Amino acid sequence: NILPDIENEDFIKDCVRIHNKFRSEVKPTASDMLYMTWDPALAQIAKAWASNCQFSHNTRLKPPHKLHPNFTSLGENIWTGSVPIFSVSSAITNWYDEIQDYDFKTRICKKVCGHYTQVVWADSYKVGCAVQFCPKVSGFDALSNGAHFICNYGPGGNYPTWPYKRGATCSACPNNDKCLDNLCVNRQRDQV
Ligand SMILES: [Zn+2]
C-alpha cells in the first residue's frame, strides 16, 4: 500500500469515479445531482491541510478566507485510519455509509452524517483530494503511522437543508444540461 500523490492519475480517477458512483445511485433519486470532476487547486488545498495531520477541519474554508479563486465557500471530508486499510474506495464508502444514520424525510442524523451529505451534495461539482502519511494525528491519539485523507468540495455543501432535491432523475438540472448516469453534465463545468 503506497499512498498516492495528488497528481497520480489513478488516484484522481478513483476519487472522481467513486464520488460519481454514489451520486448516481442515490435513493431517493435526485433531480439536480451535478456530475463531479477533479479540481487540482482543490487537491492542493487538501494536501496543505492534510500535511498538518490534525483530525479537524481546515480553518480557512469560509469568508473572510478564500482559498480557491472560484468558490466563496469550500466543503471538506476527512478520513483518518491505518495505512493498510486506506483506499480511496474505503474512505469515500466510509463517508457515504453514514447514510445508515440519516433519515432523508426529516433530515435527522442519529450520529454523524455530514460526510455522507457532502458526498451527495447536488450543487457540489468539483472535488480535490490528498492523502498524507501521519506518524500521529492530533485529536486521534490512538492512531500511529496512519493515512490522513482529505477531500475538498466546490462549492461547499452542508447547508441546513436536504443535500439534493429528491425527484425524477435529472429532471431539474441547470440550463438544458444533459444527463449521464443520473448526473447533470455540462461541458463548461466539467472541464478540468
Ligand atoms: Zn467532518
From Swiss-Prot:
Domain SCP: 16-153
Keyword list, A-Z: Membrane, Signal, Transmembrane, Transmembrane helix
Its membrane topology: Single-pass membrane protein
Major localization listed first in the record, in broad terms: membrane
A GO BP annotation: sexual reproduction
Gene: GLIPR1
Cellular component, GO, one term: plasma membrane
Name the UniProt record assigns to this protein: Glioma pathogenesis-related protein 1
Subcellular location as annotated: Membrane
Family assignment from sequence similarity: Belongs to the CRISP family.
Top-rank lineage group of the source organism: Eukaryota
Tissues where the protein occurs: According to PubMed:8973356, it is ubiquitously expressed with high levels in lung and kidney and low levels in heart and liver. Highly expressed in cell lines derived from nervous system tumors arising from glia, low or absent in non-glial-derived nervous system tumor cell lines. Also found in fetal kidney. According to PubMed:7607567 it is expressed only in brain tumor glioblastoma multiforme/astrocytoma and not in other nervous system tumors or normal fetal or adult tissues.
